[PDB]
Coordinates of C-alpha atoms in Angstrom, one line a residue:
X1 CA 89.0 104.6 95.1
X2 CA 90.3 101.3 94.6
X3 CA 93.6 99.9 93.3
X4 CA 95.1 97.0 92.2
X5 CA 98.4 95.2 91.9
X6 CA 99.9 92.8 89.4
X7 CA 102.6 91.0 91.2
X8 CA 104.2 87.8 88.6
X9 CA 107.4 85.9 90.5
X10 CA 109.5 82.9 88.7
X11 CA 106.4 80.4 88.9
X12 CA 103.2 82.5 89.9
X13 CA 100.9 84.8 89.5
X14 CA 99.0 86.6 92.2
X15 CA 97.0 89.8 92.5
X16 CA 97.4 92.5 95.1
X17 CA 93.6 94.8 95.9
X18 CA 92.6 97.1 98.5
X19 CA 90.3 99.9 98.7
X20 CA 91.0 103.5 100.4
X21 CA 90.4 107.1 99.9
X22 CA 93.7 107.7 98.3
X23 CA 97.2 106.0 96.9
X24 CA 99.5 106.4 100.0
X25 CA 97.0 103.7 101.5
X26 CA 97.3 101.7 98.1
X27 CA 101.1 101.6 97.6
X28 CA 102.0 101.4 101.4
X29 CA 99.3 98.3 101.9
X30 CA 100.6 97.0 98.7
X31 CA 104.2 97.1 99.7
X32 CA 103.1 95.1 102.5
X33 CA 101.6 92.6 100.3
X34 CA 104.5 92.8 97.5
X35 CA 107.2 92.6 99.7
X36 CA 106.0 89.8 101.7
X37 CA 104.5 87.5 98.9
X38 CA 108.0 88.8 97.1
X39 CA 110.8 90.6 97.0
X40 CA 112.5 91.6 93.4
X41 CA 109.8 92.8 90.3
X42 CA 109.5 95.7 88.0
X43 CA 107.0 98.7 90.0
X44 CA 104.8 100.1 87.8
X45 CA 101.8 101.6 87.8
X46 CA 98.6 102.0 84.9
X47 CA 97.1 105.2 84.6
X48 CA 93.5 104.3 84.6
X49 CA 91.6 102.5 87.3
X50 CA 95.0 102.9 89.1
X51 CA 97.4 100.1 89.2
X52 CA 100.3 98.8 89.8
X53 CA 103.1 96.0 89.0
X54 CA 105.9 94.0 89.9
X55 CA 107.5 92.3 87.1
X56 CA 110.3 89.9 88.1

């Protein structure tokens, strides 16, 4: 499964991806990702093709 992350800041837009056999893989990688491209944003998540957000 793969999942992807919608991370927008003040000025930017960038997008979080990585593929794994589950979510604990997809949120902890992502908060690697979030957390050091940012670090304030609204989590959220699209039930779908599994997603998440960070809206700042």
């Amino acid at each position: 499964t793969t999942y992807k992350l919608i991370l927008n800041l003040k000025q930017a837009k960038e997008e979080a991806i990585k593929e794994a056999v589950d979510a604990g893989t997809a949120e902890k990688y992502f908060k690697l990702i979030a957390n050091a491209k940012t670090v304030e944003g609204v989590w959220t998540y699209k039930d779908e093709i599994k997603t998440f957000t960070v809206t700042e």
